[PDB]
RNA sequence: UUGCUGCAGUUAAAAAGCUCGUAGUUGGAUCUCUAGCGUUUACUUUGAAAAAAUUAGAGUGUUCAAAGCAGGCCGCCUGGAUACCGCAGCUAGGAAUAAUGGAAUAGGACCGCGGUUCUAUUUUGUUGGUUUUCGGAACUGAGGCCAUGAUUAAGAGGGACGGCCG
RNA sequence: CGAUGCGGCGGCGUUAUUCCCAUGACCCGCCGGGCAGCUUCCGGGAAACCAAAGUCUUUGGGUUCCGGGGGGAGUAUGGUUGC
C-alpha cells in the first residue's frame, strides 16, 4: 500500500494476476510440439485446444478436448516452443 | 457502459489523492486526458506520468504530489464565451488567487487564464485546484 | 454485462503484444490462403476454420500471417456465405426453439427465451441493413 | 542498382552502390541482390563523432531485404569502413487533410500513410533483428516527451552496442528522443 | 502569505506531513513529530545531529505510518538499501 | 419548500411485480488551395445591420435632489456622448472538441494514348457550294504508375466451439 | 479477513479403480463470475445503520419511472379493459 511501483511489478505477481487485468496483456496459453510414440513426423498443437486432433502420419488421436487445457494421450511427449 | 472516459480518469485521480496513494493507474488513455494531465502538470499539481502503450488503447501511471485538493469533470461539454467565463470561474474555483478551468478551444486544450490572454472561447472539459 | 442476462462474465481471448510471425512457422501467406480455401470448400464457418487452423496447423492468428481476416479472404475470392455467421446461427436457434414450442403450449420459459432471441435477430438485422450487407427489404419469418 | 524518384544520384549512394556490386560475384547472394535495389543512402553523426549509415529501400522489397539483412550488414561493414549500417523503409508521408487542401485529395488517405503509423513502422524497420516487445512514453516536468523501447533477450549481444546508434539516429528523422531497455522476461 | 507590499501576513506557517504532504492541523492530536538520531560513521555513537519526520493523524490511523517512516528512513539513508 | 446552476425517493411523501422494445436522450481508442476551391456543419472570435423612450452611463450647482437637456465667458467658446440590444438571418479568421463521409463484386485517383455524334462562329481581301483543324462536351478499345486501396482488435457487445454445472 | 458454490490453473502427501501414469474423494494456494458473513474513524447519514445508502456546497459518468405538510382520497366524475 502507498508505495508500489505500478510501473515495474515483480514478474511472479505479474503471472499470478488475471491475463486481462495485467499491466500489458499476454495469454497464459502457448504452442507446443508433440512427438507420437508410433511415428517420426512432428506436429504443433495449441495448449488449450478444442478439437480432437489427428496425426495423419499413423492416424492416431493426440490431445482430448477438456474444460481448460487439452489432455495429451499416454506415450505422446509434449515440449514447449520458444 | 463507459461514456466520457475523462470522467473516470479524473474521478480515479481524485479518489487516489484523497486515499493518499503516491501513484494512480488510469485506463484507457486518450489525447484529451494526456493534454488535460499536461495542463495539470505545467502548473505543478501531479508531476511526471508514464503512458503504458499496449496496441489496443494505452494506460497512464501518474506520480501524485500531495497538492491536488479537487479535479472535477463538467459533463456535458458546455459552450463557454469570454463574457460568460467570469460566471464559470466565480462558480467552480474556490478562490480568485488559485484554481483553473480547462477549456478545449480552436487554439487547443488550455486553462482559463491563457484563454483570456489569447482571447478565445471554447468547450469546458473540467476544473482542478 | 450481457445483452439479455444479469451475469457480468469476463471471459474472452487475450491476443499477445508481439504481432511478429513466430520464427518456427514454416507455412507462407499463400500456403495459409490455400489451406483456408480447401477448408472453406468443405462447408465450414470462419469461426470453425480459425479454430481448426489454430489447433491442427499451428497458425496463431490468420490476420497476422496473411494481412487479412477470414470473412475478408472468402469475400475477396467469393466463397463467403449469403447470411453472416452470427445472424444465421441466431435464426437456426430461433427456428429450433419455435420447433420445440409448436408441441409444448405450456412451456412459458421457451416463449420468454424465444422473445429474447427474436430481439437479438432484429437488433443485428438493423445493423447489417445500416452497413448495406443485407437488402433493405429483408424481413424475418 | 539505384533508381531515385528525383532522377538525381548523390556521391554517397553512388559510392555504396559500387560497394554492393562486389557481393553479387564475390559471395553466394547473387540470386538475392539481383532482383533487389536501394533508393537512397545517407550518413549521420551520432554519439559526438560516431558515423552511422542509413539505406532507404522500397517497402515491397523490404520483406526480402529482412531475410539477408543480418548477414548483409556484416558484409557491408567489412567491405568499407567499420561503421554501423541500418536499412530504413522509404515511407511517403501524406499530410492530414485540412479545411484548405489542394486539388489532389480525391481519395481517402490510408492509415498506413499517417505520421504515427509511419514513425512506428520506421522504429520497427530500424530494430528488425530485435523485435519490439514493449513501448512507454514518459512526460517530464518541462513538457518534453521520452520513448522507452523494451526489446527481447534473444539477440541482446547482437545490438547491445547499437543503443547509441539507435538513440542518435531516431531524433534525426522523427524529432523525438528514444531509449532502449532489456527486460528479463 | 505575501501582499504586494512584501511583508508576510500570517500567524504561523503550518507544518506539512513528511509522508502524505497534507497540512497538520492546529488540533491534530494524533499527529507525530519523531526525531531519529545520526551515528558517527566509524564508532557508531550519537554525534548530536538528528533527522526529524512529521506524520498526520490520517496516516497514523490508516496504519501506514510504519511504511512511511521506513521508506523515509530508506530515502534519507538511515536504513540500509535492500 | 419546483432544484439547469441546485433538492429528494432503505425507515420521514416517494423505485413501476418483472423482463423485452420502437420514438426520445447518451455513446470506447485511433488519422501531423489552385476567376473557382477545400467534405459539410455545430462551436468560438471579429465585422455590418439593428427607432426612440426605458435601463446602465459621460458632461452640466434644477438653490440640492427626483428631474430637465440644458448651458458657460467679457458679440463669443460649447453640449445634445458612450454601452447593452436574447435567438435567428448575413460577414471574415481559428480548426482543439462533437457529428458526417472521401477507394472493397474496384464503373478508384493521377498521366499521356484510338475512334462516334455535334458544335465555335477566327480563316483562304469581301462574297456563294464541299472538306478541315484550333476552341468545347458525353460514349467508350487498351496502356503506365500508385510503397495501389481494409488502423486497431475495448478488463464494450453479439456469435462459434470445448468440458462441465444447477 | 476467513469461509462457501461453479469452472479453470499450479503443487508435497493420504487413500479407491490391484500396480505405473490417468481419473475420482481429501489437502494447500491462485484466478474469474455468483449467495452471503465478520471487522474497520475510507467516507457518508437526522440517526438506526450502509463497503454502499461512499466518491454531495471540494455540488455535473449515461439514462428511465417518480415525491412536494396532514386529511378529503386512490374518493367523485369521464374515459378505457372485463362475463
Say if CB E76 and CB E51 are below 8 A apart.
Answer: yes
Distance measured from the CA of protein residue C118 to the C1' of nucleotide G81, in angstroms: 28
Which has the closest alpha carbon to D113: D126, D135, D134, D97? D97
Q: Do A53 and C55 touch (CB under 8 A)?
A: yes
Dihedral sign (CA B17, B19, B22, B24) = negative
Strand pairing partners for B110?
Answer: B103
Say if CB D46 and CB D10 are below 8 A apart.
Answer: no
Distance measured from the CA of protein residue B9 to the C1' of nucleotide G59, in angstroms: 19
List of chains touching B (3+ CB pairs within 8 A): A, C, D, E
Say if CB A45 and CB B62 are below 8 A apart.
Answer: no
Which has the closest alpha carbon to D38: D91, D87, D93, D78? D87
Count how many Cα atoms sit within 13 Å of the Cα of residue C140 in the half-sphere of its side chain.
19
How near does any CA of chain B get to the CA of D183, in Å? Answer: 15
Map residue C122 onto helix, strand or coil. helix
Contacts of D44 (CB under 8 A, 6+ apart): D51, D52, D54, D168, D169, D172
Distance CA B81, CA B86 (A): 10
Which has the closest alpha carbon to B39: B2, B17, B68, B81? B68
For residue E66, CA distances in Å to D89, E36, E53, E62 come to 56, 14, 12, 10
Say if CB C55 and CB A32 are below 8 A apart.
Answer: no
Resolution in A: 3.2
Distance CA A3, CA E71 (A): 9
Say if CB B33 and CB B49 are below 8 A apart.
Answer: no
CA B54 to chain centroid:
23
Strand pairing partners for B108?
Answer: none
Distance CA C52, CA C39 (A): 9
Place of cell 444465421: C88
Contacts of E32 (CB under 8 A, 6+ apart): E54, E55, E60, E65
Distance CA B9, CA B14 (A): 9
Distance CA D117, CA D112 (A): 6
The 10 Å Cβ neighbour count of residue E63 is: 9
Which has the closest alpha carbon to D144: D177, D112, D170? D177
* Chains D and C physically touch (3 or more Cβ atom pairs below 8 Å): yes
Contacts of A51 (CB under 8 A, 6+ apart): A65, C51, C52, C55, C56
Distance CA B49, CA B64 (A): 9
For residue D54, CA distances in Å to A43, D37, D40, D81 come to 42, 14, 8, 14
Find the closest chain A residue to D133 by CA distance.
A24
Length of chain A: 82
> Sheet harboring D40-46: ordered strands across?
D40-46, D50-57, D84-89
CA–CA–CA angle B122, B123, B129 (5° rounding): 105
For residue E59, CA distances in Å to B91, B109, D48, E62 come to 33, 36, 50, 5
Which has the closest alpha carbon to B109: B42, B12, B18? B42
Grid cell digits, residue C21: 510471425
Say if CB E34 and CB E55 are below 8 A apart.
Answer: yes
State which residues between 35 and 74 of chain A bring their CB within 7 Å of strand F: 50-51, 65-68
Instruction: Write down the domain spans for chain E.
Output: 1-82
- Exp. method: cryo-EM
CA–CA–CA angle A43, A20, B72 (5° rounding): 160
DSSP state of C127: H
Chain A residues touching residue E64 (CB < 8 angstroms):
1-2
Distance CA B115, CA B96 (A): 16
Instruction: Write down the domain spans for chain C.
Output: 26-80, 81-141
DSSP C80-121: --SS-HHHHHHHHHHHHHHHHHTT-SS-HHHHHHHHHHHHHH
Which has the closest alpha carbon to B58: D97, D116, C86? D116
First to last CA, chain D: 42
Strand-strand pairing, D50-57 and D84-89: parallel
Amino acid at each position: 500500500p502507498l508505495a508500489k511501483d505500478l510501473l515495474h511489478p515483480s514478474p511472479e505477481e505479474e503471472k499470478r494476476k488475471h491475463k486481462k487485468k495485467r499491466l500489458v496483456q499476454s495469454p497464459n496459453s502457448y504452442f507446443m510440439d508433440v512427438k507420437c510414440p508410433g511415428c517420426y513426423k512432428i506436429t504443433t498443437v495449441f495448449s488449450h485446444a478444442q478439437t480432437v486432433v489427428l496425426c495423419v502420419g499413423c492416424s492416431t488421436v493426440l490431445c482430448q478436448p477438456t474444460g481448460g487445457k487439452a489432455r495429451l494421450t499416454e506415450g505422446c511427449s509434449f515440449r514447449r516452443k520458444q | 457502459v463507459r461514456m466520457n472516459v475523462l470522467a473516470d480518469a479524473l474521478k480515479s485521480i481524485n479518489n487516489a489523492e484523497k486515499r493518499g496513494k503516491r501513484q494512480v493507474l488510469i485506463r484507457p488513455c486518450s489525447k484529451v486526458i494526456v493534454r488535460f494531465l499536461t495542463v495539470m502538470m505545467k502548473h505543478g499539481y501531479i508531476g511526471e506520468f508514464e503512458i503504458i502503450d499496449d496496441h489496443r488503447a494505452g494506460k497512464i501511471v501518474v506520480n501524485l504530489t500531495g497538492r491536488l485538493n479537487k479535479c472535477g469533470v463538467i459533463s456535458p461539454r458546455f459552450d463557454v464565451q469570454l463574457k460568460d467565463l467570469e460566471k464559470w470561474q466565480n462558480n467552480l474555483l474556490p478562490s480568485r488567487q488559485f484554481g483553473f478551468i480547462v477549456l478545449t478551444t480552436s487554439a487547443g486544450i488550455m486553462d482559463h487564464e491563457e484563454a483570456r490572454r489569447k482571447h478565445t472561447g471554447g468547450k469546458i472539459l473540467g476544473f482542478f485546484f | 454485462g450481457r445483452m439479455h442476462a444479469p451475469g457480468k462474465g469476463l471471459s474472452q481471448s487475450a491476443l499477445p503484444y508481439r504481432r511478429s510471425v513466430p520464427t518456427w512457422l514454416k507455412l507462407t501467406s499463400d500456403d495459409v490462403k490455400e489451406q483456408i480455401y480447401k477448408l472453406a470448400k468443405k462447408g465450414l464457418t470462419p469461426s470453425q476454420i480459425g479454430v481448426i487452423l489454430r489447433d491442427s496447423h499451428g497458425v496463431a492468428q490468420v490476420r497476422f500471417v496473411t494481412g487479412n481476416k477470414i470473412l475478408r479472404i472468402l469475400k475477396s475470392k467469393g466463397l463467403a456465405p449469403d447470411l453472416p455467421e452470427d445472424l444465421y446461427h441466431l435464426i437456426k436457434k430461433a427456428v429450433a426453439v419455435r420447433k420445440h414450442l409448436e408441441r409444448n403450449r405450456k412451456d412459458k420459459d421457451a416463449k420468454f427465451r424465444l422473445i429474447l432471441i427474436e430481439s437479438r435477430i432484429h437488433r443485428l438485422a438493423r445493423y447489417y441493413k445500416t452497413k448495406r450487407v443485407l437488402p433493405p427489404n429483408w424481413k424475418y419469418e | 542498382i539505384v533508381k531515385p524518384n528525383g532522377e538525381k544520384p548523390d556521391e554517397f549512394e553512388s559510392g555504396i552502390s559500387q560497394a554492393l556490386l562486389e557481393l553479387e560475384m564475390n559471395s553466394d547472394l547473387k540470386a538475392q541482390l539481383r532482383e533487389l535495389n536501394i533508393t537512397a543512402a545517407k550518413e549521420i553523426e551520432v554519439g559526438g563523432g560516431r558515423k552511422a549509415i542509413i539505406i532507404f529501400v522500397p517497402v515491397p522489397q523490404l520483406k526480402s531485404f529482412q531475410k539477408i539483412q543480418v548477414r548483409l550488414v556484416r558484409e557491408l561493414e567489412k567491405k568499407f569502413s567499420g561503421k554501423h549500417v541500418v536499412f530504413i523503409a522509404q515511407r511517403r508521408i501524406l499530410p492530414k487533410p485540412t479545411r484548405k487542401s489542394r486539388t489532389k485529395n480525391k481519395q481517402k488517405r490510408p492509415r498506413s500513410r499517417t505520421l504515427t503509423a509511419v514513425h512506428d513502422a520506421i522504429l520497427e524497420d530500424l530494430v528488425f533483428p530485435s523485435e519490439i516487445v514493449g513501448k512507454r512514453i514518459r512526460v517530464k516536468l518541462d513538457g518534453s516527451r521520452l520513448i522507452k523501447v523494451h526489446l527481447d533477450k534473444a539477440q541482446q549481444n547482437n545490438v547491445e552496442h547499437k543503443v547509441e546508434t539507435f538513440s542518435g539516429v531516431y531524433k534525426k528523422l522523427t524529432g523525438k528522443d528514444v531509449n532502449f531497455e532489456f527486460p528479463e522476461f | 502569505m505575501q501582499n504586494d507590499a512584501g511583508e508576510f501576513v500570517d500567524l504561523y506557517v503550518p507544518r506539512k506531513c513528511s509522508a502524505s504532504n497534507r497540512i497538520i492541523g492546529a488540533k491534530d492530536h494524533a499527529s507525530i513529530q519523531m526525531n531519529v538520531a545520526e551515528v558517527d560513521k566509524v564508532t557508531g555513537r550519537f554525534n548530536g545531529q538528528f533527522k526529524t519526520y512529521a506524520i498526520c493523524g490520517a496516516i497514523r490511523r490508516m496504519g501506514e505510518s510504519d511504511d512511511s517512516i521506513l521508506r523515509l528512513a530508506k530515502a534519507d539513508g538511515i536504513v540500509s538499501k535492500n
